[PDB]
Amino acid sequence: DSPEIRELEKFANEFKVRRIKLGYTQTNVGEALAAVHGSEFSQTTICRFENLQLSFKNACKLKAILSKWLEEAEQVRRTTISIAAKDALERHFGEQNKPSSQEIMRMAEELNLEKEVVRVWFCNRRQREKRVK
Amino acid sequence: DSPEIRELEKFANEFKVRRIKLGYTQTNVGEALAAVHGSEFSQTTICRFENLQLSFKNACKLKAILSKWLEEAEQVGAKRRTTISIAAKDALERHFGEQNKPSSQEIMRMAEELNLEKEVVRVWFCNRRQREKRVK
DNA sequence: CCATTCATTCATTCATTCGG
């Protein structure tokens, strides 16, 4: 907890209500940002901001981009991992956040998954713990 | 089913009687929730709850919101859709038994076989899959 | 007025690019 996170929550909550009152969807705000940013975002990225599911540094950046736009908008292929593997992987994650290159292959065989998918899983799992909750 | 689902049925029955005895319609309950929730629901959403046509997690969520409303409401108060042909739906349900999650290619094979757009068939299987995840 | 369907939005995973 910190005065910056509190001001971050307040803005994310205020951005959500004013976005809905203005009739914008998460996909629309992500699209209508090239005017203030020079490139558009995605409904995924916006959802992460409103729910603060991104890093603190990324949040301060996007809050700056989004605050300038909000004012300006005031007018008049994938492979899904089994449920049994996820609780096991999350269980392995509790005992070793950073597993070795050999531990990854040893578990990839225990779960019948490719080496990369288990490797990237722990990567994304680690980044998940770097969020603003 | 599980002991938690049993308590879920029980509440829906008690919610339905207390909702009707208080003279609330499904559309009215959805609107009269902004006072205790901050945003309203829809007659569709309420109907799904009474019939337990939602996911187990979703039912527990709504049961929490609606129970808080019942307490607060029992202490002061008293575009266009395109319909898919019947022959195609029976065909899709026939296709669904031999493959719940069809590939991107089977969807085009069925869209042509049933004279439907590819997206319409994609969303059908999506909604069909969710239908097997609801509690009732 | 309730039930059911088609259609869309919001949330989450798995995945890829690209600076230090």
Added chain:
DNA sequence: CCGAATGAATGAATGAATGGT
């Protein structure tokens, strides 16, 4: 090669439209 910044593809929740089954 590591991790930070981002999204397409997927699963999840919720509505408007339509049909009364």
